[PDB]
Amino acid sequence: MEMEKEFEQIDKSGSWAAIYQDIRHEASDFPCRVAKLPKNKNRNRYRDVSPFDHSRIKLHQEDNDYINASLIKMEEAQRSYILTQGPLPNTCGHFWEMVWEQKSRGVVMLNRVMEKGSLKCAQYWPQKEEKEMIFEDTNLKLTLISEDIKSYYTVRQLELENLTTQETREILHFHYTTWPDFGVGESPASFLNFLFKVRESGSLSPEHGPVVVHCSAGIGRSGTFCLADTCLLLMDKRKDPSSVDIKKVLLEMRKFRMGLIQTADQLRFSYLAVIEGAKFI
Ligand SMILES: [Cl-]
Ligand SMILES: [Cl-]
Ligand SMILES: [Cl-]
Ligand SMILES: [Cl-]
Ligand SMILES: [Cl-]
Ligand SMILES: [Cl-]
Ligand SMILES: [Cl-]
Ligand SMILES: [Cl-]
């Protein structure tokens, strides 16, 4: 659109770093008192990445209500997302408790469990049908029903059972497995194909709870996913689709969780994905 002209402008002038730093400087600052309580030290993967008190997801069971997760409610775009860190070995039961209580239908994972030889996330779902997972703290059972492994992502059908009530729910697990180890993708094509697969699944529909999106810290790749999805919604929905300002959308999102988009390359990649995605739609 006109967006692609502004994009070439930013590239010519080499000012992605400058735009990104303005975003960091204008971003909202809200308290994260609960996240920083001493008893929550082992529920945070990165001490530098915390949910704001006002938007944090609260667990319902009689125990510590804390999980490192934030509700991002985009009013104009009419979509909500839960952004969360990759679960830790002691928070997988909390993670699936949140999926249950928030009535999510899909989980979007944007990292490999290990990248460049380092763990980014616990193995929080079963890899084999016959070896289900029981989370004794939150009283939940999780079974792999089937999985469709494709070249750039995997979709799994998971069965989540509340062992307290014996109610069961089918959760769709969308695992984007091909984000580059370093930097961002030269092209947003496979990321966009992945987004549209998630959309096509129904998981983002308002009849469900918000999709749960995560990477390692729940702000960088996760922020890219939600930013692009929301901008593409706004471009398809607004009377004047050229009025969608990606930087403004990102600042709005950052009222709900700190640090969304962690690098100027991720910002540039987001612009690129929205540009290419808008052509498609
Ligand atoms: Cl405490
Ligand atoms: Cl919005
Ligand atoms: Cl993995
Ligand atoms: Cl494929
Ligand atoms: Cl959609
Ligand atoms: Cl990550
Ligand atoms: Cl806007
Ligand atoms: Cl930041």
PDB file of C-alpha atoms and ligand atoms in Angstrom:
ATOM      1  CA  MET A   1       0.000   0.000   0.000  1.00  0.00           C
ATOM      2  CA  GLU A   2       1.403   3.355   1.110  1.00  0.00           C
ATOM      3  CA  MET A   3       2.948   1.331   3.952  1.00  0.00           C
ATOM      4  CA  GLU A   4       5.367  -0.260   1.482  1.00  0.00           C
ATOM      5  CA  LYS A   5       6.594   3.204   0.486  1.00  0.00           C
ATOM      6  CA  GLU A   6       7.262   4.181   4.109  1.00  0.00           C
ATOM      7  CA  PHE A   7       9.037   0.813   4.474  1.00  0.00           C
ATOM      8  CA  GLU A   8      11.476   1.491   1.625  1.00  0.00           C
ATOM      9  CA  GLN A   9      11.974   4.960   3.108  1.00  0.00           C
ATOM     10  CA  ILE A  10      12.981   3.514   6.496  1.00  0.00           C
ATOM     11  CA  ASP A  11      15.308   1.088   4.741  1.00  0.00           C
ATOM     12  CA  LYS A  12      16.974   3.775   2.622  1.00  0.00           C
ATOM     13  CA  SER A  13      17.452   6.095   5.620  1.00  0.00           C
ATOM     14  CA  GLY A  14      18.509   3.127   7.809  1.00  0.00           C
ATOM     15  CA  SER A  15      16.376   4.287  10.725  1.00  0.00           C
ATOM     16  CA  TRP A  16      14.786   1.043  12.001  1.00  0.00           C
ATOM     17  CA  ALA A  17      16.945   1.270  15.125  1.00  0.00           C
ATOM     18  CA  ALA A  18      15.702   4.824  15.700  1.00  0.00           C
ATOM     19  CA  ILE A  19      12.011   4.006  15.244  1.00  0.00           C
ATOM     20  CA  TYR A  20      12.372   0.981  17.552  1.00  0.00           C
ATOM     21  CA  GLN A  21      14.041   3.041  20.288  1.00  0.00           C
ATOM     22  CA  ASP A  22      11.282   5.664  20.099  1.00  0.00           C
ATOM     23  CA  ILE A  23       8.815   2.815  20.718  1.00  0.00           C
ATOM     24  CA  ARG A  24      10.818   1.698  23.747  1.00  0.00           C
ATOM     25  CA  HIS A  25      10.850   5.265  25.043  1.00  0.00           C
ATOM     26  CA  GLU A  26       7.136   5.928  24.546  1.00  0.00           C
ATOM     27  CA  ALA A  27       6.046   2.529  25.892  1.00  0.00           C
ATOM     28  CA  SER A  28       3.710   2.344  28.891  1.00  0.00           C
ATOM     29  CA  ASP A  29       5.103   1.707  32.364  1.00  0.00           C
ATOM     30  CA  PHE A  30       2.735  -0.010  34.823  1.00  0.00           C
ATOM     31  CA  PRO A  31       3.453  -1.854  38.081  1.00  0.00           C
ATOM     32  CA  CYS A  32       4.326  -5.571  38.177  1.00  0.00           C
ATOM     33  CA  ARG A  33       4.189  -5.905  41.952  1.00  0.00           C
ATOM     34  CA  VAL A  34       2.787  -9.433  42.044  1.00  0.00           C
ATOM     35  CA  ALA A  35       5.303 -10.770  39.507  1.00  0.00           C
ATOM     36  CA  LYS A  36       8.125  -9.414  41.718  1.00  0.00           C
ATOM     37  CA  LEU A  37       6.901 -10.905  45.008  1.00  0.00           C
ATOM     38  CA  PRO A  38       9.546 -13.202  46.551  1.00  0.00           C
ATOM     39  CA  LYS A  39       7.266 -16.255  46.346  1.00  0.00           C
ATOM     40  CA  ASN A  40       6.988 -15.864  42.522  1.00  0.00           C
ATOM     41  CA  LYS A  41      10.757 -15.920  41.873  1.00  0.00           C
ATOM     42  CA  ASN A  42      10.624 -19.474  40.459  1.00  0.00           C
ATOM     43  CA  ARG A  43       7.562 -18.747  38.246  1.00  0.00           C
ATOM     44  CA  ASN A  44       9.419 -16.247  36.061  1.00  0.00           C
ATOM     45  CA  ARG A  45      11.730 -17.485  33.306  1.00  0.00           C
ATOM     46  CA  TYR A  46      13.375 -14.051  32.901  1.00  0.00           C
ATOM     47  CA  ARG A  47      13.538 -11.650  35.831  1.00  0.00           C
ATOM     48  CA  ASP A  48      13.507  -8.804  33.262  1.00  0.00           C
ATOM     49  CA  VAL A  49      10.155  -9.811  31.691  1.00  0.00           C
ATOM     50  CA  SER A  50       7.084  -9.535  33.948  1.00  0.00           C
ATOM     51  CA  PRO A  51       3.314  -9.134  33.440  1.00  0.00           C
ATOM     52  CA  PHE A  52       1.717  -5.889  34.556  1.00  0.00           C
ATOM     53  CA  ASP A  53      -0.582  -6.279  37.550  1.00  0.00           C
ATOM     54  CA  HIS A  54      -3.557  -4.805  35.677  1.00  0.00           C
ATOM     55  CA  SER A  55      -3.486  -7.281  32.770  1.00  0.00           C
ATOM     56  CA  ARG A  56      -1.963 -10.413  34.342  1.00  0.00           C
ATOM     57  CA  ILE A  57      -3.817 -13.739  34.107  1.00  0.00           C
ATOM     58  CA  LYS A  58      -4.923 -14.955  37.550  1.00  0.00           C
ATOM     59  CA  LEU A  59      -5.149 -18.701  38.275  1.00  0.00           C
ATOM     60  CA  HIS A  60      -8.381 -19.715  40.005  1.00  0.00           C
ATOM     61  CA  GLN A  61      -7.374 -22.605  42.290  1.00  0.00           C
ATOM     62  CA  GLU A  62      -6.671 -22.222  46.026  1.00  0.00           C
ATOM     63  CA  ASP A  63      -2.951 -21.559  45.860  1.00  0.00           C
ATOM     64  CA  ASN A  64      -0.767 -18.796  44.562  1.00  0.00           C
ATOM     65  CA  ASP A  65      -2.710 -17.280  41.616  1.00  0.00           C
ATOM     66  CA  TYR A  66       0.423 -16.195  39.733  1.00  0.00           C
ATOM     67  CA  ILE A  67       1.475 -17.067  36.195  1.00  0.00           C
ATOM     68  CA  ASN A  68       3.711 -15.015  33.907  1.00  0.00           C
ATOM     69  CA  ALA A  69       1.001 -14.287  31.360  1.00  0.00           C
ATOM     70  CA  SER A  70      -0.863 -11.197  30.180  1.00  0.00           C
ATOM     71  CA  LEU A  71      -4.258 -10.624  28.559  1.00  0.00           C
ATOM     72  CA  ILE A  72      -3.836  -8.378  25.473  1.00  0.00           C
ATOM     73  CA  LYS A  73      -7.305  -7.071  24.590  1.00  0.00           C
ATOM     74  CA  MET A  74      -7.298  -5.157  21.297  1.00  0.00           C
ATOM     75  CA  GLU A  75     -10.541  -3.216  21.419  1.00  0.00           C
ATOM     76  CA  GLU A  76     -10.749  -1.824  17.896  1.00  0.00           C
ATOM     77  CA  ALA A  77      -9.562  -5.048  16.258  1.00  0.00           C
ATOM     78  CA  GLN A  78     -11.947  -7.093  18.443  1.00  0.00           C
ATOM     79  CA  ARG A  79      -9.365  -9.753  19.291  1.00  0.00           C
ATOM     80  CA  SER A  80      -7.809 -10.890  22.561  1.00  0.00           C
ATOM     81  CA  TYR A  81      -4.603 -12.860  23.097  1.00  0.00           C
ATOM     82  CA  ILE A  82      -2.854 -14.304  26.111  1.00  0.00           C
ATOM     83  CA  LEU A  83       0.898 -13.863  25.816  1.00  0.00           C
ATOM     84  CA  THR A  84       2.974 -15.964  28.144  1.00  0.00           C
ATOM     85  CA  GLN A  85       6.520 -17.171  28.620  1.00  0.00           C
ATOM     86  CA  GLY A  86       7.523 -20.688  27.601  1.00  0.00           C
ATOM     87  CA  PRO A  87       6.493 -22.739  30.656  1.00  0.00           C
ATOM     88  CA  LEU A  88       9.084 -23.866  33.204  1.00  0.00           C
ATOM     89  CA  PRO A  89       9.412 -27.374  34.664  1.00  0.00           C
ATOM     90  CA  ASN A  90       7.374 -26.271  37.716  1.00  0.00           C
ATOM     91  CA  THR A  91       4.729 -24.169  35.859  1.00  0.00           C
ATOM     92  CA  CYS A  92       3.418 -26.613  33.225  1.00  0.00           C
ATOM     93  CA  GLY A  93       0.459 -27.434  35.483  1.00  0.00           C
ATOM     94  CA  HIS A  94      -0.212 -23.695  35.898  1.00  0.00           C
ATOM     95  CA  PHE A  95       0.044 -23.240  32.122  1.00  0.00           C
ATOM     96  CA  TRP A  96      -2.600 -25.873  31.361  1.00  0.00           C
ATOM     97  CA  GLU A  97      -4.744 -24.640  34.264  1.00  0.00           C
ATOM     98  CA  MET A  98      -4.727 -21.233  32.565  1.00  0.00           C
ATOM     99  CA  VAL A  99      -5.737 -22.791  29.232  1.00  0.00           C
ATOM    100  CA  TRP A 100      -8.624 -24.548  31.013  1.00  0.00           C
ATOM    101  CA  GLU A 101      -9.866 -21.588  33.069  1.00  0.00           C
ATOM    102  CA  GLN A 102      -9.546 -19.076  30.233  1.00  0.00           C
ATOM    103  CA  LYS A 103     -11.358 -21.456  27.829  1.00  0.00           C
ATOM    104  CA  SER A 104      -8.702 -21.206  25.142  1.00  0.00           C
ATOM    105  CA  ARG A 105      -9.085 -23.411  22.051  1.00  0.00           C
ATOM    106  CA  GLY A 106      -5.577 -22.988  20.625  1.00  0.00           C
ATOM    107  CA  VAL A 107      -1.999 -22.682  21.830  1.00  0.00           C
ATOM    108  CA  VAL A 108       0.502 -20.976  19.515  1.00  0.00           C
ATOM    109  CA  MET A 109       4.158 -21.912  20.098  1.00  0.00           C
ATOM    110  CA  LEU A 110       6.817 -19.934  18.214  1.00  0.00           C
ATOM    111  CA  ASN A 111      10.127 -21.512  19.282  1.00  0.00           C
ATOM    112  CA  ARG A 112      11.724 -24.935  19.288  1.00  0.00           C
ATOM    113  CA  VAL A 113      12.075 -26.376  22.815  1.00  0.00           C
ATOM    114  CA  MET A 114      15.849 -25.997  22.242  1.00  0.00           C
ATOM    115  CA  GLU A 115      17.504 -23.498  19.889  1.00  0.00           C
ATOM    116  CA  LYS A 116      21.243 -22.980  19.389  1.00  0.00           C
ATOM    117  CA  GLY A 117      21.648 -25.748  21.979  1.00  0.00           C
ATOM    118  CA  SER A 118      19.823 -23.831  24.766  1.00  0.00           C
ATOM    119  CA  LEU A 119      16.430 -24.616  26.318  1.00  0.00           C
ATOM    120  CA  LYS A 120      13.731 -22.032  25.598  1.00  0.00           C
ATOM    121  CA  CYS A 121      10.727 -23.912  27.032  1.00  0.00           C
ATOM    122  CA  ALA A 122       9.782 -27.005  29.042  1.00  0.00           C
ATOM    123  CA  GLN A 123       8.361 -30.078  27.285  1.00  0.00           C
ATOM    124  CA  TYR A 124       4.889 -29.180  28.461  1.00  0.00           C
ATOM    125  CA  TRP A 125       2.919 -31.495  26.135  1.00  0.00           C
ATOM    126  CA  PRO A 126       3.093 -35.244  25.430  1.00  0.00           C
ATOM    127  CA  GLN A 127       5.178 -36.375  22.469  1.00  0.00           C
ATOM    128  CA  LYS A 128       3.714 -39.926  22.459  1.00  0.00           C
ATOM    129  CA  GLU A 129       0.044 -40.983  22.520  1.00  0.00           C
ATOM    130  CA  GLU A 130       0.626 -43.738  25.122  1.00  0.00           C
ATOM    131  CA  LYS A 131       2.574 -41.480  27.502  1.00  0.00           C
ATOM    132  CA  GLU A 132       0.020 -38.911  28.613  1.00  0.00           C
ATOM    133  CA  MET A 133       0.908 -36.166  31.101  1.00  0.00           C
ATOM    134  CA  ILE A 134      -0.759 -35.710  34.490  1.00  0.00           C
ATOM    135  CA  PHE A 135      -0.302 -32.404  36.303  1.00  0.00           C
ATOM    136  CA  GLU A 136      -0.971 -33.400  39.867  1.00  0.00           C
ATOM    137  CA  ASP A 137      -0.835 -29.875  41.313  1.00  0.00           C
ATOM    138  CA  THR A 138      -3.636 -28.531  39.083  1.00  0.00           C
ATOM    139  CA  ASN A 139      -5.383 -31.921  38.558  1.00  0.00           C
ATOM    140  CA  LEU A 140      -5.239 -32.043  34.776  1.00  0.00           C
ATOM    141  CA  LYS A 141      -4.484 -34.762  32.237  1.00  0.00           C
ATOM    142  CA  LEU A 142      -3.100 -34.096  28.773  1.00  0.00           C
ATOM    143  CA  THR A 143      -3.051 -36.647  25.938  1.00  0.00           C
ATOM    144  CA  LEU A 144      -1.576 -36.427  22.465  1.00  0.00           C
ATOM    145  CA  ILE A 145      -4.375 -37.548  20.130  1.00  0.00           C
ATOM    146  CA  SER A 146      -2.688 -36.934  16.794  1.00  0.00           C
ATOM    147  CA  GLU A 147      -0.178 -34.683  15.133  1.00  0.00           C
ATOM    148  CA  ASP A 148       0.217 -33.392  11.599  1.00  0.00           C
ATOM    149  CA  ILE A 149       3.877 -32.524  11.021  1.00  0.00           C
ATOM    150  CA  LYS A 150       4.409 -30.190   8.069  1.00  0.00           C
ATOM    151  CA  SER A 151       7.568 -28.684   6.628  1.00  0.00           C
ATOM    152  CA  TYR A 152       7.371 -25.334   8.513  1.00  0.00           C
ATOM    153  CA  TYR A 153       4.989 -26.037  11.413  1.00  0.00           C
ATOM    154  CA  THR A 154       3.277 -28.883  13.265  1.00  0.00           C
ATOM    155  CA  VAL A 155      -0.375 -28.937  14.406  1.00  0.00           C
ATOM    156  CA  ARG A 156      -1.245 -31.341  17.245  1.00  0.00           C
ATOM    157  CA  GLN A 157      -4.641 -32.402  18.528  1.00  0.00           C
ATOM    158  CA  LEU A 158      -4.394 -32.560  22.321  1.00  0.00           C
ATOM    159  CA  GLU A 159      -7.021 -33.774  24.776  1.00  0.00           C
ATOM    160  CA  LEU A 160      -7.041 -31.806  28.034  1.00  0.00           C
ATOM    161  CA  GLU A 161      -9.079 -33.411  30.812  1.00  0.00           C
ATOM    162  CA  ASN A 162     -10.061 -31.704  34.046  1.00  0.00           C
ATOM    163  CA  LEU A 163      -9.615 -34.722  36.299  1.00  0.00           C
ATOM    164  CA  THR A 164     -11.791 -33.029  38.939  1.00  0.00           C
ATOM    165  CA  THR A 165     -14.902 -32.956  36.716  1.00  0.00           C
ATOM    166  CA  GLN A 166     -13.810 -35.494  34.049  1.00  0.00           C
ATOM    167  CA  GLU A 167     -14.769 -32.917  31.425  1.00  0.00           C
ATOM    168  CA  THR A 168     -12.492 -33.005  28.348  1.00  0.00           C
ATOM    169  CA  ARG A 169     -11.613 -30.424  25.708  1.00  0.00           C
ATOM    170  CA  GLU A 170      -9.801 -30.612  22.390  1.00  0.00           C
ATOM    171  CA  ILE A 171      -6.925 -28.113  22.292  1.00  0.00           C
ATOM    172  CA  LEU A 172      -5.177 -27.338  19.005  1.00  0.00           C
ATOM    173  CA  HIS A 173      -1.422 -26.857  19.337  1.00  0.00           C
ATOM    174  CA  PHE A 174       0.105 -24.763  16.525  1.00  0.00           C
ATOM    175  CA  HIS A 175       3.870 -25.112  16.660  1.00  0.00           C
ATOM    176  CA  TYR A 176       5.796 -22.834  14.284  1.00  0.00           C
ATOM    177  CA  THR A 177       9.109 -24.655  14.065  1.00  0.00           C
ATOM    178  CA  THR A 178      11.095 -22.678  11.494  1.00  0.00           C
ATOM    179  CA  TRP A 179      11.840 -19.233  12.918  1.00  0.00           C
ATOM    180  CA  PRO A 180      15.584 -18.748  12.220  1.00  0.00           C
ATOM    181  CA  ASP A 181      18.110 -19.373  15.006  1.00  0.00           C
ATOM    182  CA  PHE A 182      19.507 -15.878  14.371  1.00  0.00           C
ATOM    183  CA  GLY A 183      17.717 -12.690  13.498  1.00  0.00           C
ATOM    184  CA  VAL A 184      14.498 -12.833  11.508  1.00  0.00           C
ATOM    185  CA  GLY A 185      13.425 -14.523   8.300  1.00  0.00           C
ATOM    186  CA  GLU A 186      14.460 -12.899   5.031  1.00  0.00           C
ATOM    187  CA  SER A 187      10.829 -13.395   3.923  1.00  0.00           C
ATOM    188  CA  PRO A 188       7.607 -13.451   5.990  1.00  0.00           C
ATOM    189  CA  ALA A 189       5.972 -16.029   3.704  1.00  0.00           C
ATOM    190  CA  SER A 190       6.014 -19.059   6.023  1.00  0.00           C
ATOM    191  CA  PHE A 191       5.206 -16.990   9.125  1.00  0.00           C
ATOM    192  CA  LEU A 192       2.194 -15.601   7.244  1.00  0.00           C
ATOM    193  CA  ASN A 193       1.160 -19.060   6.011  1.00  0.00           C
ATOM    194  CA  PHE A 194       1.368 -20.196   9.641  1.00  0.00           C
ATOM    195  CA  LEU A 195      -0.766 -17.249  10.825  1.00  0.00           C
ATOM    196  CA  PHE A 196      -3.461 -18.072   8.261  1.00  0.00           C
ATOM    197  CA  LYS A 197      -3.448 -21.727   9.315  1.00  0.00           C
ATOM    198  CA  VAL A 198      -4.123 -20.600  12.894  1.00  0.00           C
ATOM    199  CA  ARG A 199      -6.901 -18.288  11.683  1.00  0.00           C
ATOM    200  CA  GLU A 200      -8.430 -21.017   9.497  1.00  0.00           C
ATOM    201  CA  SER A 201      -8.521 -23.353  12.507  1.00  0.00           C
ATOM    202  CA  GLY A 202     -11.132 -21.260  14.333  1.00  0.00           C
ATOM    203  CA  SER A 203      -8.831 -20.857  17.366  1.00  0.00           C
ATOM    204  CA  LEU A 204      -8.945 -17.051  17.199  1.00  0.00           C
ATOM    205  CA  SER A 205     -12.742 -16.896  17.042  1.00  0.00           C
ATOM    206  CA  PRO A 206     -14.462 -14.857  19.785  1.00  0.00           C
ATOM    207  CA  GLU A 207     -16.613 -17.851  20.673  1.00  0.00           C
ATOM    208  CA  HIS A 208     -13.495 -19.239  22.404  1.00  0.00           C
ATOM    209  CA  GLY A 209     -11.284 -17.923  25.149  1.00  0.00           C
ATOM    210  CA  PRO A 210      -8.242 -16.006  23.927  1.00  0.00           C
ATOM    211  CA  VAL A 211      -5.565 -17.951  22.085  1.00  0.00           C
ATOM    212  CA  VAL A 212      -2.472 -18.582  24.233  1.00  0.00           C
ATOM    213  CA  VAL A 213       0.686 -17.438  22.397  1.00  0.00           C
ATOM    214  CA  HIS A 214       4.222 -18.037  23.644  1.00  0.00           C
ATOM    215  CA  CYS A 215       7.895 -18.152  22.721  1.00  0.00           C
ATOM    216  CA  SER A 216      10.661 -18.163  25.336  1.00  0.00           C
ATOM    217  CA  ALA A 217       9.874 -14.859  27.099  1.00  0.00           C
ATOM    218  CA  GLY A 218       6.470 -14.267  25.527  1.00  0.00           C
ATOM    219  CA  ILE A 219       7.234 -10.812  24.113  1.00  0.00           C
ATOM    220  CA  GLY A 220       9.442 -10.990  20.993  1.00  0.00           C
ATOM    221  CA  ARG A 221       8.212 -13.584  18.506  1.00  0.00           C
ATOM    222  CA  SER A 222       4.901 -13.635  20.403  1.00  0.00           C
ATOM    223  CA  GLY A 223       4.669  -9.867  19.938  1.00  0.00           C
ATOM    224  CA  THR A 224       5.351 -10.262  16.235  1.00  0.00           C
ATOM    225  CA  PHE A 225       2.560 -12.822  15.886  1.00  0.00           C
ATOM    226  CA  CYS A 226      -0.034 -10.716  17.647  1.00  0.00           C
ATOM    227  CA  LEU A 227       1.083  -7.401  16.092  1.00  0.00           C
ATOM    228  CA  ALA A 228       0.799  -8.757  12.546  1.00  0.00           C
ATOM    229  CA  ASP A 229      -2.537 -10.453  13.179  1.00  0.00           C
ATOM    230  CA  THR A 230      -4.057  -7.298  14.704  1.00  0.00           C
ATOM    231  CA  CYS A 231      -2.707  -4.965  12.016  1.00  0.00           C
ATOM    232  CA  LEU A 232      -4.055  -7.259   9.314  1.00  0.00           C
ATOM    233  CA  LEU A 233      -7.462  -7.291  11.031  1.00  0.00           C
ATOM    234  CA  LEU A 234      -7.458  -3.489  11.175  1.00  0.00           C
ATOM    235  CA  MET A 235      -6.431  -3.171   7.513  1.00  0.00           C
ATOM    236  CA  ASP A 236      -9.247  -5.458   6.402  1.00  0.00           C
ATOM    237  CA  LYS A 237     -11.817  -3.792   8.673  1.00  0.00           C
ATOM    238  CA  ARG A 238     -11.170  -0.040   8.638  1.00  0.00           C
ATOM    239  CA  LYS A 239     -12.920   2.260   6.195  1.00  0.00           C
ATOM    240  CA  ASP A 240      -9.457   3.566   5.239  1.00  0.00           C
ATOM    241  CA  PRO A 241      -7.032   0.600   5.451  1.00  0.00           C
ATOM    242  CA  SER A 242      -4.039   2.920   4.901  1.00  0.00           C
ATOM    243  CA  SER A 243      -4.690   4.573   8.271  1.00  0.00           C
ATOM    244  CA  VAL A 244      -3.285   1.530  10.131  1.00  0.00           C
ATOM    245  CA  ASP A 245      -0.102   2.743  11.874  1.00  0.00           C
ATOM    246  CA  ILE A 246       1.979  -0.243  12.994  1.00  0.00           C
ATOM    247  CA  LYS A 247       3.907   1.730  15.617  1.00  0.00           C
ATOM    248  CA  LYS A 248       0.646   2.968  17.183  1.00  0.00           C
ATOM    249  CA  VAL A 249      -0.792  -0.555  17.264  1.00  0.00           C
ATOM    250  CA  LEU A 250       2.374  -1.800  18.972  1.00  0.00           C
ATOM    251  CA  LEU A 251       2.255   0.940  21.600  1.00  0.00           C
ATOM    252  CA  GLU A 252      -1.390   0.013  22.283  1.00  0.00           C
ATOM    253  CA  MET A 253      -0.359  -3.622  22.747  1.00  0.00           C
ATOM    254  CA  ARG A 254       2.443  -2.584  25.072  1.00  0.00           C
ATOM    255  CA  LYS A 255      -0.128  -1.146  27.493  1.00  0.00           C
ATOM    256  CA  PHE A 256      -0.873  -4.812  28.263  1.00  0.00           C
ATOM    257  CA  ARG A 257       2.553  -6.464  28.317  1.00  0.00           C
ATOM    258  CA  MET A 258       6.024  -4.946  28.399  1.00  0.00           C
ATOM    259  CA  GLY A 259       8.674  -5.301  25.720  1.00  0.00           C
ATOM    260  CA  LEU A 260       6.609  -6.604  22.793  1.00  0.00           C
ATOM    261  CA  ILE A 261       9.014  -6.783  19.821  1.00  0.00           C
ATOM    262  CA  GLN A 262      12.530  -7.192  21.274  1.00  0.00           C
ATOM    263  CA  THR A 263      14.693  -5.926  18.348  1.00  0.00           C
ATOM    264  CA  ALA A 264      14.642  -3.484  15.465  1.00  0.00           C
ATOM    265  CA  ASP A 265      14.882  -6.478  13.092  1.00  0.00           C
ATOM    266  CA  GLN A 266      11.706  -7.930  14.616  1.00  0.00           C
ATOM    267  CA  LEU A 267      10.024  -4.565  14.081  1.00  0.00           C
ATOM    268  CA  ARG A 268      11.157  -4.516  10.457  1.00  0.00           C
ATOM    269  CA  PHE A 269      10.022  -8.137  10.024  1.00  0.00           C
ATOM    270  CA  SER A 270       6.591  -7.175  11.434  1.00  0.00           C
ATOM    271  CA  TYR A 271       6.222  -4.326   8.909  1.00  0.00           C
ATOM    272  CA  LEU A 272       7.248  -6.742   6.169  1.00  0.00           C
ATOM    273  CA  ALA A 273       4.713  -9.392   7.245  1.00  0.00           C
ATOM    274  CA  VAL A 274       1.861  -6.882   7.453  1.00  0.00           C
ATOM    275  CA  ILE A 275       2.774  -5.499   4.019  1.00  0.00           C
ATOM    276  CA  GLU A 276       2.927  -8.950   2.414  1.00  0.00           C
ATOM    277  CA  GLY A 277      -0.089 -10.201   4.350  1.00  0.00           C
ATOM    278  CA  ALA A 278      -2.226  -7.260   3.234  1.00  0.00           C
ATOM    279  CA  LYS A 279      -1.524  -7.962  -0.438  1.00  0.00           C
ATOM    280  CA  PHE A 280      -2.656 -11.563   0.121  1.00  0.00           C
ATOM    281  CA  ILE A 281      -5.965 -10.479   1.692  1.00  0.00           C
TER     282      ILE A 281
HETATM  283 CL    CL B   1       6.036 -13.236  48.755  1.00  0.00          CL
HETATM  284 CL    CL B   2      -7.031  -2.669  18.117  1.00  0.00          CL
HETATM  285 CL    CL B   3      10.437 -28.341  19.992  1.00  0.00          CL
HETATM  286 CL    CL B   4       4.376 -28.602   4.208  1.00  0.00          CL
HETATM  287 CL    CL B   5      -9.185 -14.094  11.360  1.00  0.00          CL
HETATM  288 CL    CL B   6      11.972 -16.968  21.494  1.00  0.00          CL
HETATM  289 CL    CL B   7      -3.595   2.872  13.692  1.00  0.00          CL
HETATM  290 CL    CL B   8      11.651  -3.086  25.195  1.00  0.00          CL
END
